[PDB]
Write a protein that binds this ligand. Structure first.
Ligand SMILES: O[C@@H](c1cc(C(F)(F)F)nc2c(C(F)(F)F)cccc12)[C@H]1CCCCN1
Ligand SMILES: O[C@@H](c1cc(C(F)(F)F)nc2c(C(F)(F)F)cccc12)[C@H]1CCCCN1
Ligand SMILES: O[C@@H](c1cc(C(F)(F)F)nc2c(C(F)(F)F)cccc12)[C@H]1CCCCN1
Ligand SMILES: O[C@@H](c1cc(C(F)(F)F)nc2c(C(F)(F)F)cccc12)[C@H]1CCCCN1
Ligand SMILES: O[C@@H](c1cc(C(F)(F)F)nc2c(C(F)(F)F)cccc12)[C@H]1CCCCN1
Lengths: 326, 326, 326, 326, 326
């Protein structure tokens, strides 16, 4: 059912569950889930039980034709939207090709939108995963040492600086998001072209006259056929186009990594006396700018950051309290 | 539904899940999943609920024929694409054979593409599994001994050298990938031949005249039949051919084992004082070249390598810090 | 769907999962899975949704006959391939019997191929299971004692010798594999005979004239019927015959137990000083020859064998290292 | 599908899984699973998707009759195999009754074959369960005491003797197996009678003339009907009869409890010095003869029996080794 | 399928699983499962895929009537077995009412048979549950104290006596079993009356003449209708009646609580020296008579009772052995 479909896609997890670590920050998962599942959701809505009257093409055989003769006419003209010579139409052969393969094309866009998140989930996900969990563990060790002192060389600061120098991972990230934006724009171009079709493009005339039926006495020369659900495809197309047009500015915002403005989440550790590491922050296209965003995603999960952020918040309203907080 | 099919194949795990150890390195799993599942995905897309109008062959019986007489004509000509004498066609009997058994042939290619990964998952997978987990355990023991020293005979170096001498496992690996490449090229040849068919090959004429109906007064001599979804098969064929043509250079890259260039992942252990083992690396077709790749897959999972790689990265930006890192 | 069927049989576990111990060595599981599941897979492929046009037999009733009268003709002639007198055919009654009961016969061969692995999984599996896990535990105890010595009577050697004397279990194993080979050859004989049928054997004429219709004025004397999917059965038959013809040499290789040549897997324990047991190996048809093969299957899982095999491999490139390896 | 059915019954567990203890010894589970599931398997094979052409009875209404009039004729004669007066047939009313209720009768035999294993699984299963696990625990305690001595009153011997005196449980067991054998013989009698039917018993003539249609001008006096799949029922009947005829000697062998000849499995404990209990064995119809068989099923699972049997086997090739074995 | 139905009801658990404690003793679960599930099993067998020819009522419209006109006739007469005036029949309106609502009536009997076990599983199950597990725990404590003594006031004896005085729980139990017996007898009365119907009760004549069709020129006055599967209902009715007639003596045996004769299961604890409690047993309708039966169900699960019963059994073939048994 359509409601079972809605629970399957919109209200279920879908590509959201896949625990301690989150290697796909906010917006990414949101953008990927909407962009991938909305062609799937709208295809499945296109052919729901309630909305599909029946056979997609009907062709108006004469009354003299039998049941299976009309079945031949319908099935032949369904197959004969493909070849050029068999049919004539005012719009042309290309919009009928789009009408037949609308769900194929939208599923192709869904898979194409799934490709850059997948290439992220293999090529760059283990590196960000291992590096971020190591940084979380090291920061927990630093706070444990500070708490022990309250009751030599900071590895985290220099390991943060050497990734400030590197920019391979951000190049992978911006390549993923740029491919996603390009595919969204191409899907917008297709959906705008498809919805802008006259809606008489589904109307066409086909002749069942190839082969021996070219020189048969009693067959109609041509058969009026309509591709049913083309209007449903156009309605779902404008819906998909509207949602993708809303989604594309979010992706363009996602491209600008340094503008995202993490609100001094790493600066909270600078307040502690022992933790002299991680004072600075990125101001450009580097790996560290992306590490700051994945940190700002995953740092609330850290044991110590929440306590030290509470210590910072009460200041926002002497470090004796920190010893007391433990 | 087509969307349920897409979630079943593209977005689900498929042949990806099957934890601590990964005995199928990157690209392999990617190439195997795409090459195996894309014939499955495109077959299931070929006969989706929306795209299938109904019966695959219709044959245009006369109006005088009843419903089940036309059913006989359709079913007989479906069966009679097989035998040579029963039908005549401009293209021939072979393309009609391909049209009837297109999903059989693509599933045969999917299983044939699944064979070399399966022969890897039995013949060579236990050996690489046991050897790699032993190497991981030994390297963890070496780092534990080094950390204990900081706070005689390295088995790993000589056990690495004796596999430098051996080349049975790489012969198995290159045999698997060569069989995969050969099957991909054969599938490309078939899909190029199938898509290059004129698309009037589906059109054919069959006579329901074998047996007693040879000398019956009132039956048509021949019946115009079209194999519906042959154009859908050709569209999915060019899609499969395009994806496999993209996939084949990746397999050819996968053949060249020593060119893969692990970026001194084993050299990180040379920096430690106690770990004097594993200084060198392969420069040819040996088992060690494949062990380096499986190592570079699985070494990020190792406890010690990540810490010692952080120690190497800060140098990239005295070993006192290592004692401090613990 | 056919792709769901393929994931159910070829790509899923099937008779592969059913952990620490493997009481069905390599090839056995491979041969059993292919031989059992390929009739199942090809039957399910025979009647897939895409390939089945509809009713399996159609019979060309006259136009005067109604819908349910033609349904009677089809259903009667389906039932009347059984009895001899009701029909006449050029090939005979036996090939039509095979055409009706092709999936029954191939499923019978699948179950018959499943019988010897099942009789192995009950009659001989507990004995090999208990004996092999006891041998693994005893060898682990021997290596633990050797490691303790490095830092009286070997039970394993004499318990190995007394099974060298016995040959009941190998008789059970060779009986299982001989029954499997005989059933494979019988299936090859059937599939070769079935594929060699002319493919006009499906064509036959039946008379709906038994009982009161013997002396009815207006019924045709005989009705041209074709058994649809017989050509599909013949194509799947030659596929099954080709795969079984490939499989039979593997079973014949599996019969020769002593020729299998375990590569001194038990000899690795002879290198240790304390482990003076298990020096020799079989050179004939005994239980010990089969125990060597199940050992060579399961010995990589053993804790100590991998370490001592690494010690042997570095030698292949004084036992001081063993004390160091621990 | 038929292959899904085969995986559901033959290749799945079925009545095999239902861990440490096995209260249904070998052959019993085998005989119960085959005898119960083979009527189920052959019924489900009788009405598979491929083998069922459609409606089971067709009756050849005149061409003047409409679609639903022929539907009435088919449905009425299906119902009117029951009453005697409505139909006439050469064979009689009883074989048509068997043809209509063949799957009911075979399922009745399946449930009747399931009754004695069920009455075993309630009436006698807890007693054999508790007694056998107590005997296993006591024998483990005896070997633990013997191992402690190596490094007064044996309860097991007298508790074994008092069950030598009793014979209630063996009476229950032989009653179960005798009921199973009697039901197998009755099923063999039915299947032999059913297969021996002429196969024109399915042919019969029925009159739709009860009630107001007795005195209606235009209806045929009688309608030629065939019960389709009766030949399929006869083929499956001879298959079931052959398998049950093979199964019945196994049940007759299962009746003779003392002849089963446990190979001195309890005598292995006599070799130990401390374990002076359980020297003798049954030579008649007693509870102890059945306890020996359930012991010989479950004693390989025991920790100590395997070690002491290894000690016995090396002798088969001074008890110093036992102290060493531990 | 019918075989899937059989695995769902007969061979699966059904109302058998619902672990340490069993608050529904033997026979109860057996009687409840058979009595509840056999109407369910026979209803599901009544409308299996193989046995149902199609529409349950067919009515023999004239040939002039169209397809949907005959559909109206069938559907109207199905609805018009309800009202008295619309139809006339030799048997009457009541047996046609039973024929239409046979599965409703048998499901009503199944639910009515499920009511007394359900009222047991709420009203009396917690009390017997808590009391029996407390008695098991107290007896285990008594044996632990006796074993400690071997190496003041018995609460169990007086707590057993005060429930000897009470009879509320046995009144609930006998009310449950009496309601079950009464419902079984009522179902037997119904099934005997239903099977004793002439089997021409399914034959009836209905007039589609209410409303505007009372004064329409061309409709038949009355239509011969048969309710198909009424004979199947009668066969399943005699099967259900036979099984319930067998079941009713078991329920009548279950009513006599004190006659059930627990074989001195509580007397085994009297043999121990410390356990001076629970010497006597019931000889009438009391709560203690039911507690003895639930004890004899659940006492084999007790740790100590099995050991002390082994001590009693060897006597059946000085208490020094008990100290030795521990
Ligand atoms: O909730 C899921 C969802 C799916 C889809 C669609 F269609 F992609 F599957 N569409 C949605 C729409 C929309 F407006 F687009 F319809 C609005 C809101 C949520 C939608 C998503 C969103 C991100 C987090 C959870 N998975
Ligand atoms: O995601 C799965 C996938 C399957 C398939 C197909 F069809 F093989 F099943 N096709 C895919 C395409 C394609 F472009 F080919 F359509 C593009 C991207 C992913 C595809 C794969 C890939 C590897 C890791 C996870 N399993
Ligand atoms: O992978 C499974 C498989 C099944 C089948 C079939 F058909 F038996 F089910 N056929 C297969 C073919 C074949 F060429 F025969 F088609 C080729 C490769 C694998 C096949 C098997 C094999 C052994 C280990 C895992 N189970
Ligand atoms: O494997 C299962 C099986 C079921 C059936 C049937 F039909 F009873 F379900 N038939 C079988 C046949 C037969 F020859 F009879 F077909 C041969 C071999 C195994 C069969 C059984 C057997 C006992 C252990 C596992 N459950
Ligand atoms: O096994 C289950 C079963 C159900 C049914 C029915 F029909 F109630 F569901 N009928 C049965 C018949 C009968 F003869 F009655 F058919 C005979 C034997 C067992 C039957 C029951 C029995 C009690 C323990 C397990 N649940």
């Amino acid at each position: 059912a359509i409601a079972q479909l809605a629970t399957e896609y919109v209200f279920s997890d879908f590509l959201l569950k896949e625990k301690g670590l989150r290697l796909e920050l906010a917006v990414d998962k949101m953008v990927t889930c909407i962009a991938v599942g909305l062609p799937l959701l709208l295809i499945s809505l296109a052919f729901a039980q309630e909305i599909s009257i029946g056979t997609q093409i009907s062709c108006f055989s004469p009354s003299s034709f039998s049941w299976r003769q009309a079945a031949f006419v319908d099935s032949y003209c369904w197959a004969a939207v493909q070849q050029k010579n068999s049919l004539q139409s005012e719009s042309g052969n290309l919009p009928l090709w789009l009408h037949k393969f609308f769900p194929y094309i939208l599923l192709l866009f869904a898979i194409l939108l799934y490709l850059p998140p997948l290439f992220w989930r293999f090529a760059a996900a283990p590196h960000i995963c291992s590096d971020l969990k190591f940084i979380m563990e090291e920061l927990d060790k630093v706070y444990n040492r500070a708490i022990k002192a309250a009751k030599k060389y900071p590895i985290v600061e220099q390991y943060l600086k050497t990734k400030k120098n590197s920019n391979n991972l951000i190049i992978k990230y911006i390549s993923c998001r740029l491919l996603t934006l390009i595919i969204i724009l191409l899907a917008c171009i297709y959906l705008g072209y498809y919805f802008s079709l006259s809606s008489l493009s589904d109307e066409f005339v086909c002749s069942i006259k190839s082969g021996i039926l070219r020189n048969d006495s009693t067959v109609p020369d041509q058969f009026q056929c309509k591709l049913i659900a083309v209007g449903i495809f156009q309605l779902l197309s404008v819906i998909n186009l509207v949602v993708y047009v809303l989604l594309a500015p979010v992706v363009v915002y996602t491209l600008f990594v340094p503008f995202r403005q993490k609100t001094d989440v790493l600066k909270v550790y600078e307040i502690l006396p022992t933790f002299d590491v991680l004072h600075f922050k990125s101001e450009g296209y580097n790996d560290l700018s992306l590490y700051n965003l994945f940190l700002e995603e995953n740092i609330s999960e850290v044991k110590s950051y929440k306590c030290l952020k509470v210590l910072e918040n009460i200041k926002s309203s002497d470090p004796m309290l920190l010893l007391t907080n433990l």
